[PDB]
Design a protein around this ligand. Sequence first.
Ligand SMILES: [Zn+2]
Lengths: 85, 278, 93, 109, 559, 286
Amino acid sequence: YLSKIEELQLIVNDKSQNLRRLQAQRNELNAKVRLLREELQLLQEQGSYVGEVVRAMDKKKVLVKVHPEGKFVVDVDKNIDINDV
Amino acid sequence: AVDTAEQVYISSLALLKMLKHGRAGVPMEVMGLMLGEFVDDYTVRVIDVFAMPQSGTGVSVEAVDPVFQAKMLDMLKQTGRPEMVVGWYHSHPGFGCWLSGVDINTQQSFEALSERAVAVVVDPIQSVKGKVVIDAFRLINANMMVLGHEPRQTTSNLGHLNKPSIQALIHGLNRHYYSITINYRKNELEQKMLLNLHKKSWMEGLTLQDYVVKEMLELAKNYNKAVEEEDKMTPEQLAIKNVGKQDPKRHLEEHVDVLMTSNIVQCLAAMLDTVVFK
Amino acid sequence: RPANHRQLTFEEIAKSAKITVNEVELLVMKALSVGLVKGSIDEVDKRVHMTWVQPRVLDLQQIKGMKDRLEFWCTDVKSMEMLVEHQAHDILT
Amino acid sequence: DLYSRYKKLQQELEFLEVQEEYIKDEQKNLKKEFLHAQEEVKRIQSIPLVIGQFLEAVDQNTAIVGSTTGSNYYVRILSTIDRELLKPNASVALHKHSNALVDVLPPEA
Amino acid sequence: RLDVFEKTILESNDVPGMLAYSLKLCMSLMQNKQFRNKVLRVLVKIYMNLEKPDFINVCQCLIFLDDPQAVSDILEKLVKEDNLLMAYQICFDLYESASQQFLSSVIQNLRTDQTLKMIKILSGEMAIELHLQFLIRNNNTDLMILKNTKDAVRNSVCHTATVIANSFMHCGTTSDQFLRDNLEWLARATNWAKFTATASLGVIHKGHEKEALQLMATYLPKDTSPGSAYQEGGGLYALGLIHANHGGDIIDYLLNQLKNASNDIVRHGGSLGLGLAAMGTARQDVYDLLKTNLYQDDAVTGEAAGLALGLVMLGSKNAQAIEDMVGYAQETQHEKILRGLAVGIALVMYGRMEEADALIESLCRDKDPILRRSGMYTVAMAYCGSGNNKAIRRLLHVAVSDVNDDVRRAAVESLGFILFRTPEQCPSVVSLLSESYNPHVRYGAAMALGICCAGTGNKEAINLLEPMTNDPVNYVRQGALIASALIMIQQTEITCPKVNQFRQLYSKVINDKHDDVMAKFGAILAQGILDAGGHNVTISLQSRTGHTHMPSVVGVLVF
Amino acid sequence: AVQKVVVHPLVLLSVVDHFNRIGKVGNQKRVVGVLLGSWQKKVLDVSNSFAVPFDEDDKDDSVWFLDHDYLENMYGMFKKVNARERIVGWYHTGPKLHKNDIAINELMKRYCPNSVLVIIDVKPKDLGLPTEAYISVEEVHDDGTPTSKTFEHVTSEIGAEEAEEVGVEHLLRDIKDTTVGTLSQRITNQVHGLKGLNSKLLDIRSYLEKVATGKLPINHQIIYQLQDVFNLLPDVSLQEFVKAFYLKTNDQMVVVYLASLIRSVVALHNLINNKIANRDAEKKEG
Ligand SMILES: [Zn+2]
């Protein structure tokens, strides 16, 4: 029972895991604050403008008539529908 | 008869002459030739990128002066190294660094004679530090659709070259073009001395200069009051009696740190006379 | 004398300079015209104050024994540099 | 088991001693890289500011601006400007190349 | 101190097996090599002092105390006492869990009916060929997945992980099925699919030792005849695959094939094969000709030189392999040659546990992330388990504080080697590692989950990898793929309910054609490792005998 | 009367690759080259240079080699690439000088208003500054000999012009802007204290070797007339800044009043809103 108090009493010192739980959570927080601000090269290509659709037609095409411009028929992306037009 | 993922161990002077050639290279596009040595199949090196006269007429294949080639290599032969050309550079300093309609001829016009003749696109007139602005490609041709367009041998070099894959007409130009890999050499033979002069010079030269001190503190403390009253216009806005404010909208900062390091500077400046004197 | 009391009294001046009290003022205003020493001479105590001067030509024995100022400076500003850095040692960081 | 019940306690204890030392140092480095991230936000612009005006916002921090270039555009806008400062067609600042909001100026003309 | 120790091993009556599990428990709290060998050699002698002799003590002290003469003494007791049936522990643990260098030294010390079964246990071919019999008799294929992954073959992993799949299923089936079913899918061969289309015969023919040459009768080194030497070099590499750790003359015959006046066209695969063959045997001739392979100044065979020379000099502490391979490291003009030499000079010092500190500090002293990466591989092999903090402090410093992610990647591969013993705390530290900001180290954290928690029954690792395949980086999604294949070895659906989820889900994400083939690059390989054996076989990084199994460690870290 | 220039180390990387030439051509150990540029003001900027194939005899050290195949027609090249960046000087390594430097300067002085021998640093381990300039001087003596021409220390720096950090600050990958007062100041304390006081050890090298084994510039005219400036305050006991100690109370006035007041506002800054965020997190985590 001599040394048989000391390891369990050093387990009493394990609020270091909780104060560092806040610290590791803050690591995650501000590290992905950083990584979230790192996304902003997405800014650096595309001022992808508002489009002017009269109506769509078949064969996976639409009618976009751009804002001071004319009729330009194109294909669609994958995350919106011909139904969504 | 076989294709491997190549690599370009650059001399930094290549990109240095490209940045001079683009900075001073007034946004009219211009043309030159690249000078390295074809070391092996899976790597190439560029040891040199030389200069051109002011060919302000148009980028074309005719703009290469062969007597300038002869005298250039001759003046490299009376200097120490008689190396070999590896290809050609050019500059696209205005637009978004993608293959012009003359390049689509002169690339294969040059690599009809040379082996690889890798194009180099530059735009240092983008912005100042954080873009990586260099662009190189390897012309694949319609002769080589016999076997597949997949060297692949060492992977993740073309996988991290594939990681951007982003220019409009160039990812349109997956056809005719697969890029080449550009790493920057273990340059400690120069990075050593660039670091050493960089930090032995970019702090007060002989570094006994600042060791201005106090009227800048007068103006700075008047800053540090004139903005502190609007700093304290925030805890009144923290009195929302119960809760009437969406998230903290935090303006604690930017006046901790300025006060902190500025008056660290002032207290170590108060040190500085008791330091220099004894 | 390297030492202080650089607000010297006029007494050594009027003794060894063969000058009088009414002429120490001319003795140093003519030196203001000369321009090698520009003292802020006291005139409530009549003290001839020492400011910056043009020192000598050669003191070869003090070119050798300037160590008590030069090496003094070197090792003592070095030691006190080591002491400032040694008290702020482990914020090397 | 008085032979290894109490001595295996140190075994998985040394390791989180070392991680307890470690996460401190990782926080010591991420402040550096946070400063690098924040300064590298501002290397591209805010000397060369072009002028459009706001039109409408679709969603969170992404909106529509017409411009003094003639046409209209739909742009991802930063969290820098406060979310209500864009009610009229106010004098706003965009990018030459890549067209995104940096700042908004309320008066003009 | 051995005074109360000696009075309490010559003590009075309890179960003497207190001391038997106390062997492993003393080994569990062991810190040094100083009274480890002391207690290790005196408990076996207090079992020789107690009247009942023991065999688990020599089963442990042969692999921790490395005495080739005491096993010769009690093997004369195996010839004299004559009971082969109690002899199984010492005999086939000496076959099972012994170092090959210690195997050669112990068959040297031992030879001075069991008169020939003393040689037959050391060759130990009986378990090899009935293991091979198991590998031909048992099977459970999924060929529909092989076709729906065969749709995306290139000069890529599909051409290699189809044969990796049904060859980790069948290490030596001695039967053609992918040779038989097609030739045009086999006709997408360009230098690495050529190297693979001739090396895959020995891939699918692990073991089956005698019929190597007469099964590659077609693949003798004049019997291929394309215009390309890789279609004939990978075949001699496949001879090197078969002739692993038990050669005879064919080690020297691949050596002579390299020395039949042939430069870097046979060596293309045959040098890899030769180094794989004479692995750890510490030969001289292969070092003699790999010195001119080292000084080829061509890394297509030079990396084979560095790798194969590290292989033949496993844990050497040579005064000339270490120095004369670190010498060529600096003045070379490439660094994939330094990858070759990197893993070579890592493998040249294995498990020394206090010796290699001069080399680790000398190489992490330098500035090169490739050479510091070499140092991290070398500290992964010098240190495995011995978390004395002499590893982990500066190892963790350079692991996660450094500026280049490749040495960081090798360091998080080192973590899985120094953390094999108690994988309980390993979720609590590698889930923390997960939080990384960078692609290679995201992937390396996934690899730490993989090679660290290979045999575990963890579900938190799967819970980690699921957002790691919900990640825009494609190859950290393949890190989730391959690492989850390494968490789904050895275990079935009753172990964790994400097994069949990922089994059908990897085909489900290979249904998506618009993913990167880098995102599904090792998806065919995740299916193959997902049935490594068909859950028949498992990894052996730390054997159940008590001692680590070093060629498996070689396999995974060069893998 | 020249203070400082602006230095692009790009053609110093040309010094680096000519330092690669000389390691593998032959007997020429030191890097000697020619420094192009343009006088703009007392401040100046350099954009290009070149490196002569140079030899120098160890016997009768005034043996130069500056080829006009390498000067005139390469000058035509460098004139064809730009008319602006013409000659301004030359460069050689070491810190000191060799003998022939004066004549190598006077060779290309015929082309330039002031040719400069910036002595360059290829293996930087120095205690003071990097590469440094020397202007044409006529100081001769107070004795009146034929006119002196040994080009005197008329200094320089390493200035930074403009952008180039597309290359440079991407090529950093290591360094950080210290928010000054964050051991940047003690980097400076180390460098300026230690490197100015072993510069003072160079001064005691002067003031010991020029006392034991050193003649004619022993007290040249600028040793004693600057021992004046050394005799600003060298004094013996504690040097008695009697004015300056209550004047240093007047100094410490501003500093520690900003410490007390301002750092008490810093106490308010961290502590009050830290208690807000802290205790809200604490019990509103329930
Ligand atoms: Zn161009």
